[model samples]
Target chain A: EAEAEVTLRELQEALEEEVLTRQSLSREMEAIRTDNQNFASQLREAEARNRDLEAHVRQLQERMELL
Target chain B: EVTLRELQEALEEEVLTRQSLSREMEAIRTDNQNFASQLREAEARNRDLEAHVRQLQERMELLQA
Candidate 1:
């Protein structure tokens, strides 16, 4: 009976450790998603800037041709 | 003895749950890496565009002068 009790206690401790691991993993996943969103937003802004610069270059080329 | 059996079962179930969570974490990490790659490409394109703009501006000044 004593051996059974000790084994049971060890199992419970392992289970608690697993639970904490799960919680930590959950938090990490959330943080990664947040970082992903921020990177996406920055990418969009960078793309838009590229478009604007390209358009400006076209305009400048047209003006130089007229000159 | 019966209680020990129940505790062992619960621990087994928790282990399975943790395994599932770990798999999900790996998937998210892969997605995050993709996003990082895309963002880097976009920034590189932006730099090229800016350089092109500067060249055009310099050409315009020469034409005007």
Candidate 2:
């Protein structure tokens, strides 16, 4: 015995709206994830370059100081 | 009747899924902004270090001459 009677058409309409919202949000989330990944990669490269430059700068300073 | 119930369940699940996706995007946005800030700082420091190194080189050349 069905307790609450909801028509099939009504349920289908609600489902379609839910599915569309979900799909749209999923696409937006995917794009943001991609942007995060790119920023991470760029940060890693920048950090490595920073380290290299710092080391070279220290070496040069030491050599100049000794002279 | 069974199909209608299943559709209701599916719709509820989809709503939950969208909420989760929004949270994930929020996290990604925060992290991306943080990294962008870090990258800017690192680039600035690198430029300054390069300039200092160039100045040191010129000073060394002067001493050598």
Candidate 3:
């Protein structure tokens, strides 16, 4: 009976460790999601800038052709 | 005194619960890895777009001059 109690205690300790590991992983996942969202926003802004620049380039080329 | 049989049952239950916890941990770890990969890809794409925008701005300056 004493041996059984010892074994049970060990198993409970292992269970607690696993729970802690899960919590850490969950936090990491949330952090990654937040970072990805920021990247997405930056990408959108860059895309808009690229479009505007391309339009300006076209206008300049048209004016140069007239010159 | 607690019977050995009762202790055995409790031990078995603990083992089962631990197994379930292990499975859940594995699943969460897999998901975390996937999210990390996606974040890396997004970062790369953002860098590429910024570089492209810089090139366009340089071209505009040349045309203006």
Question: Which predicted model would earn the best lDDT?
Answer: 2
Model 2: lDDT equals 0.79
Instruction: Give the alpha carbon lDDT tens digit for every residue of B17-47 in model 1.
Output: 7788778778777877887787788778778
DockQ of each candidate relative to the true complex? 0.57, 0.53, 0.12
In order of the candidates, what TM-score does chain B achieve?
0.82, 0.90, 0.81
Cα deviation in Å at residue B41, candidate 2? 2.3
Q: List the per-model TM-score of the A chain.
A: 0.86, 0.81, 0.87
Better of 2 and 3 by TM-score: 2
For candidate 1, write residues A3-40 as lDDT tens digits.
76787777778777878877887787778778777877
lDDT of 3 by residue, B1-65 (tens): 44456656756765675676567667666765766676676667667656766766776678789
Each model's lDDT? 0.77, 0.79, 0.65
Which tens-of-lDDT digit does each residue in B1-65 have in candidate 2? 44866876877788788788778867887896788789789878878987997899799889989
Model 3 chain A lDDT-worst window of ten: A56-65
B6, model 3: CA deviation in Å?
Answer: 14
lDDT per residue as tens, model 3, A1-67: 5777777667666656766776676576667657666756766676676667667666765765575
The number of the candidate with the highest TM-score is 1
Judged by TM-score relative to the true structure, which candidate is superior, 1 or 3?
1
Predicted structure with the largest DockQ when compared to the true one: 1
Q: Rank the candidates by lDDT, best first.
A: 2, 1, 3
Badly placed stretches (over 4 Å) of model 3 are: B1-65
Number of colliding residue pairs in model 1: 0
**Tens-place lDDT digits, model 2, residues A10-62:** 66776788688778878877887887788788788878978887897888789
